[PDB]
Ligand binder design. Structure first.
Ligand SMILES: *[C@@H]1O[C@H](CO)[C@@H](O[C@@H]2O[C@H](CO)[C@@H](O[C@@H]3O[C@H](CO)[C@@H](O)[C@H](O)[C@@H]3O)[C@H](O)[C@H]2NC(C)=O)[C@H](O)[C@H]1NC(C)=O
Ligand SMILES: *[C@@H]1O[C@H](CO)[C@@H](O[C@@H]2O[C@H](CO)[C@@H](O)[C@H](O)[C@H]2NC(C)=O)[C@H](O)[C@H]1NC(C)=O
Ligand SMILES: *[C@@H]1O[C@H](CO)[C@@H](O[C@@H]2O[C@H](CO)[C@@H](O)[C@H](O)[C@H]2NC(C)=O)[C@H](O)[C@H]1NC(C)=O
Ligand SMILES: *[C@@H]1O[C@H](CO)[C@@H](O[C@@H]2O[C@H](CO)[C@@H](O)[C@H](O)[C@H]2NC(C)=O)[C@H](O)[C@H]1NC(C)=O
Ligand SMILES: *[C@@H]1O[C@H](CO)[C@@H](O[C@@H]2O[C@H](CO)[C@@H](O)[C@H](O)[C@H]2NC(C)=O)[C@H](O)[C@H]1NC(C)=O
Ligand SMILES: *[C@@H]1O[C@H](CO)[C@@H](O[C@@H]2O[C@H](CO)[C@@H](O)[C@H](O)[C@H]2NC(C)=O)[C@H](O)[C@H]1NC(C)=O
Ligand SMILES: [Ca+2]
Ligand SMILES: [Ca+2]
Ligand SMILES: [Ca+2]
Ligand SMILES: [Ca+2]
Ligand SMILES: [Cu+2]
Ligand SMILES: [Cu+2]
Lengths: 710, 714
């Protein structure tokens, strides 16, 4: 396919890139699994998109297939001055070069900036096990659990990030928890700060300890004060509160399964590889291991609407009474947001009738890993007609009833980084409207209860505070409305007050249409202080048959506000969250608003979205990129136990045609039904697809749950 | 059954009330259809809810069933000083009184304020046929259609409201249109202003004429100037192979053919909700519902977990406020309760309007009718998968496997009706999720309000076809949300995030700038009347004094989904009719004299209506430990665009709000659901799929499609 230009790497390709790099013996490559930080390893391999200039020549002007390459992130820890360096490896097939990417003169913290890995976690656990030995009796008395000879009663930890107070530090606060079903909700009241910056884990140290509201300096000191009675201790078969297992009873119990979708005539969309056709729609998709889901080269009616719509970052920003809590600003691209695309359970995560798609990731692994049912694609009834009208004759009857059943195409994946489960949707309606949606579920990020915690959260159980936080998500929306060069305008209603033209002594105070043009980037960078104009329009200079510019409208569904003070420390990592909408001129050097490095060096990251606006460029008839921030404040509440639920917990945006088509583009749909009356006879039910009452069975439920090399 | 207290009038009850009034010969009642305005007629009969005090004592304290009554609106046209007077007729069964209802002594303009009727429309058509005789040749030449001697090429009109420039006037602008398929979108360029205030239709006059950008004084004057070649006329093409642009008939082809039917719901096990009369049980939920003929859908006595959450959530008003270049366009402020928003609940098409698996419900309305009228499939109630899990988690072991996967399939219960007043089809949903979340939603579809294109119209709308402007407007909807959170006595508080700037407690040379949780308490109505200029706090909480087991007040959170803003200037003329639209949220102390924010009379006397919402805030009452009522304005600006042809579509054109428990329950109330599935690993074995309901693969069929399309007495 042509859409293959946008496709993620196959298992064959990942092996080819990996083998190529491994045959370069001077890289001294070792497996991700090797239990030392003092090693060189390939941390991530994923497809590296070609330049847009070359892609559009191939797609639109019949030129050469662009060169295909892989981005390869290499952790160089086996050298005097450790760093991370990225390369473009190509061509594919038949790799033979390795070209260094994105140099950064004067930046010294690339090593400290890197994501945590499985090997690093194992070394942290060992550090923890050793360092907390003096606390063994303290653990047994207070929790009934421990790190030693613990078996089914083991302590665990959750690290928070960022990890220190300045660029170059790798000092993590660790929340100690009981490792039981839903361990996230079982903090013991102990937190530990561990310096794990050295490539020699022998050097790693607990530098500070916090327990039940007091700092202690070391595990030995806490152990001593415990022994001398100078510590205020909290000593910690229905289901566990942190379990999903049912309990309680509805006043009106429900004993049977609810209604389900059947698809006896098979999918109405066509999936070939990473390429989808659906009525008027055509698009390609990919699942970028670093940043997550994208749709690319989106067309309706054979015309381009958007070159790229992509998830860029997903953040959860906390306050807290405990050190771990006040430390937490999670930026999930730093945890491989697009690589934790775990198995979709048929019937639950997508309809039983969905098409489930597998993929492969190479992220912190020894070999490419198979991820079954990583995505799904499905049509489902929306339960509301796309359009309907009852045309009454106002004398007890009707001229006609017309209706179009509501259907939507949904491309879906998830990310479960750790405790959060985010459900990522791109949704395509038959009338050319597309929607992006993120739904939040899974376990809340929580810390140990003390009275002081009630200033930064809610008590959810006996020992549990749900910390206040804001979720924010950034999308890149590279609209190319009917072609590459667009303009941006907004529309507002403004009142006029005129003489009533048929009654001169009176006034008419009424709506008029007010149009605002935007010439320069800064004018189109909307802050949260300003109210957003109601119509956000991306226009083609082409006019429709009625004289109006062909356009697509962006409509944001969000509750987001300004969270961090602009200019203050870690806020440098998320300057995009200043803007619910910002428009930039397309540049190859500005493809992403975040990176895998932002989480662990938010102070001096390699991409600062705000910098994209510094040159305040002209945006009249240019390749424009819309960037959208959506989010919501989440003050936890008892109903979040065991999990946050999806209803009302979604954000996103709509893209709607606005004077783009001559009339409703869903008019081509043959699903429409019109009912007409006949004189002294039955009504005529006019259809273009026969009525269907066929039923069928979906595959029986299965779930694997493992993700392994092939 | 107890929910009967909330039930709409039966066909038998409506007849009983109509019969009782007709038996009083001094009322001189004539049928609605009699084509004179100088008549006495019963315009509307509907159930009149008993006092909350009495309903609650019945429902909660074992006291007597409250007396059942009907509201009866009587048009007294057959007298020297015509008026509209309402009565409460009761008891039911066995009506033997008619007491005064909503008396407004000292008000004189009730007649002018009254809704238009089928009979009045017929007299308007007759007036136009006569008044426009001079324009007959003009009509035939410019449109190919006529008012006089027409059969299949008839001109029609669409009247706009309000009908004048001050209280007491009934002067309507009429948009003249060709009566073809989707006639709404076929204006001729002519608009006529008719004074139809007199009860003698012989006095009615076309007082002004607008055609293609100029005013003309009379039909005779336009006819003369046309004859003398002095008018720039627009000759419309003949509208009567391809569908008319205003038809829903398909045209064009998708580049990727869709020839088979899409996926559809099956319900082999039947409804999981228990619907009995107007009472519904659904897992945690219990509620009653009704469809008030005047104002529309209501859910009542809403409980979850055996505790009351809301005494009433109801539609109050639905408005479309226009601008325009034509006089009709610039006049239009439609308030749909003045047109019987609750009475235009036309037949829902199975498989389209609701799923084929839905339970469809008939009702009866008595609104501008000679007899109670049967409305087939006025409502539907159905459960549908949402396509998104209510909750799910993959608990990875971070080494190629998992500890468990847990998920709960997404389902929701939807109670739905529609209102097709004229051109708009509004779809009204109340939605109930198994975790105690409820949602109110309105979806807009149908035909836009449109006027004749001229270049000047581009300042107030969008050219949608050759001769067609879609006028700019804002949709505004008002809801009454009488939350009774765990009981009648509530308070209202909001939560905001506020940053603090403190010394980093483990690194003294540094700062922690972080979120804290800030709580604001509200004491008086005015403090909780949030205007559209004001930032709406992110957490709007209606609280009960009772705490959950973790020490937090039990509450329900109101979350608004809207794009609405201030449309009319506060205090200016017709804005008096929609002062509720100043507030996305306002909170009032409960009162029997303040049950409604609008009325059927607001549309035609917006200057001096019987209820001004702002007056509910005047006395600035205490709202601590009180029976509170939340009132919610939602809406959107709609600038029409060519994709609105032939109809506005529902995607991205809905508004509403959510109610969500906030520390009301000790933990997730969906935990009682047996639909939850947890998959667990086993060493050297297949996974154990833990269930509490057996896996379903069953099949069934719904009934074959039928549609009637008529609504008549039985
Ligand atoms: C709106 O119109 C209604 C009906 O025409 C008015 O109610 C009617 O009021 C008249 C005059 O008060 C009542 O007529 C009779 O008057 C004689 C004496 O002159 C009296 O002895 C009779 O008992 C009788 O009252 C009539 O009862 C009453 N009809 C009804 C059904 O109530 C109403 O007053 C008008 N509203 C306004 C604001 O003017
Ligand atoms: C990060 O470390 C890498 C690998 O050690 C450095 O790249 C090497 O630099 C040496 C000295 O110039 C070259 O001779 C090698 O060819 C490079 N190796 C590879 C694999 O490219 C690099 O200089 C360091 N990066 C930064 C920014 O300091
Ligand atoms: C619309 O404009 C009119 C006229 O400019 C305003 O009416 C004037 O208001 C002042 C103060 O109330 C009166 O003294 C004048 O006599 C009015 N003039 C006329 C011709 O009516 C009116 O207030 C404006 N309305 C709005 C909402 O802006
Ligand atoms: C938080 O408070 C600190 C301390 O009051 C502020 O830091 C001071 O900033 C000024 C510049 O405006 C410097 O001259 C001082 O040296 C700083 N004091 C200290 C102790 O560092 C800080 O700016 C505040 N931050 C925010 C976002 O309000
Ligand atoms: C999950 O998937 C894996 C991989 O397909 C399954 O393991 C394979 O099982 C087949 C069939 O018995 C064996 O022949 C292979 O040796 C296995 N491959 C690997 C890589 O282990 C596994 O059985 C599935 N697990 C569950 C619980 O269904
Ligand atoms: C619509 O429903 C009406 C009312 O039930 C049907 O009208 C009845 O039709 C039957 C014959 O099928 C007659 O016996 C009755 O006399 C009719 N009743 C009335 C009140 O008119 C009608 O047939 C249905 N229409 C369609 C098109 O299905
Ligand atoms: Ca720029
Ligand atoms: Ca672009
Ligand atoms: Ca009051
Ligand atoms: Ca209340
Ligand atoms: Cu959250
Ligand atoms: Cu509209």
């Amino acid at each position: 396919r042509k859409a293959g230009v946008f496709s993620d790497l196959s298992n064959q390709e990942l092996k080819a890139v990996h083998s190529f790099l491994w045959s370069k013996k001077e890289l001294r490559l070792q497996p991700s699994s090797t239990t030392t930080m003092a090693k060189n390893t390939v941390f991530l391999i994923e497809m590296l998109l070609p330049k847009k200039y070359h892609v559009l020549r191939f797609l639109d002007k019949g030129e050469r297939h662009p060169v295909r390459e892989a981005r390869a992130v290499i952790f160089f820890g086996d050298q005097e001055h450790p760093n991370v360096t990225e390369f473009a490896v190509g061509p594919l097939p038949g790799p033979c070069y390795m070209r260094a990417l994105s140099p950064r003169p004067g930046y010294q913290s690339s090593w400290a900036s890197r994501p945590i890995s499985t090997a690093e976690y194992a070394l942290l656990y060992h550090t923890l096990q050793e360092a907390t030995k003096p606390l063994h009796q303290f653990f047994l008395n207070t929790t009934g659990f421990s790190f030693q000879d613990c078996h089914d009663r083991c302590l665990a930890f959750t690290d928070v990030a960022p990890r220190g107070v300045a660029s170059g530090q790798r000092r993590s606060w660790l929340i100690i928890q009981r490792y039981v079903e839903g361990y996230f909700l079982h903090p013991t009241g102990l937190e530990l700060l561990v310096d794990h910056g050295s490539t020699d884990a022998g050097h790693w140290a607990v530098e500070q300890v916090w327990y039940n509201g007091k700092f202690y300096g070391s595990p030995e000191e806490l152990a001593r004060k415990y022994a001398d009675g100078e510590v205020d201790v909290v000593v910690l078969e229905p289901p566990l509160f942190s379990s999903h297992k049912p309990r309680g009873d509805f006043p009106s119990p429900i004993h049977v399964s609810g209604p389900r979708l059947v698809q006896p005539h098979g999918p109405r969309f066509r999936l070939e590889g990473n390429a989808v056709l659906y009525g008027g729609w055509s698009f390609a998709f990919r699942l970028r291991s670093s940043s997550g889901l994208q749709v690319l080269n989106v067309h309706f009616g054979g015309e381009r609407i958007a070159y790229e719509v992509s998830v860029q970052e997903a953040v959860a920003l906390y306050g807290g009474h405990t050190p771990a809590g006040m430390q937490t600003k999670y930026l999930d691209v730093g945890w491989g947001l697009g690589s934790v695309t775990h198995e979709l359970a048929p019937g639950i995560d997508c309809p039983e009738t969905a098409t489930f798609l597998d993929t492969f990731h190479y992220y912190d692994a020894d070999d490419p890993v198979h991820y079954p049912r990583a995505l799904c694609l499905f049509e489902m009834p929306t339960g509301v007609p796309l359009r309907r009208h009852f045309n009454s004759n106002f004398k007890g009857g009707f001229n006609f009833y017309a209706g179009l059943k509501g259907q939507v195409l949904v491309l879906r994946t998830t990310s479960t980084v750790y405790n959060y489960d985010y459900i990522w949707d791109f949704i395509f309606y038959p009338n050319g409207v597309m929607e992006a949606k993120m739904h939040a579920t899974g376990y809340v990020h929580a810390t140990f209860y003390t009275p002081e915690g009630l200033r930064h959260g809610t008590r959810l159980h006996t020992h549990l505070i749900g910390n206040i936080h804001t979720h924010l998500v950034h999308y890149r929306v590279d609209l190319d409305v009917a072609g590459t060069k667009n303009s941006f305008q907004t529309l507002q209603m403004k009142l006029e007050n005129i003489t009533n033209p048929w009654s001169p002594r009176h006034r008419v105070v009424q709506p008029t249409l007010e149009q605002t043009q935007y010439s320069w980037e800064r004018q189109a960078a909307f802050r949260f202080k300003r109210k957003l104009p109601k119509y956000l329009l991306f226009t083609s200079p082409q006019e429709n048959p009625w004289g109006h510019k062909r356009s697509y409208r962006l409509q944001i569904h969000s509750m987001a506000d300004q969270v961090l003070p602009p200019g203050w420390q870690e806020e440098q990592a998320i300057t995009w969250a200043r803007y619910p909408l910002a428009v930039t001129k397309y540049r190859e050097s500005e493809l992403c608003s975040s990176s895998i490095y932002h989480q662990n060096d938010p102070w001096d990251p390699p991409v600062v979205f705000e910098q994209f606006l510094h040159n305040n460029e002209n945006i009249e008839n240019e390749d424009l990129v819309a960037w959208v921030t959506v989010g919501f404040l989440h003050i936890p509440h008892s109903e979040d136990i065991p999990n946050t639920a999806t209803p009302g917990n979604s954000v996103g945006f709509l893209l709607r045609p606005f004077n783009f088509f001559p009339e409703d583009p869903s008019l081509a749909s043959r699903d429409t039904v019109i009912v007409w009356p006949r004189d002294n006879g039955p009504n005529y039910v006019q259809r273009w697809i026969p009525e269907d009452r066929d039923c069928s069975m979906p595959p029986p439920f299965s779930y694997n749950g493992t993700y392994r090399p092939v």
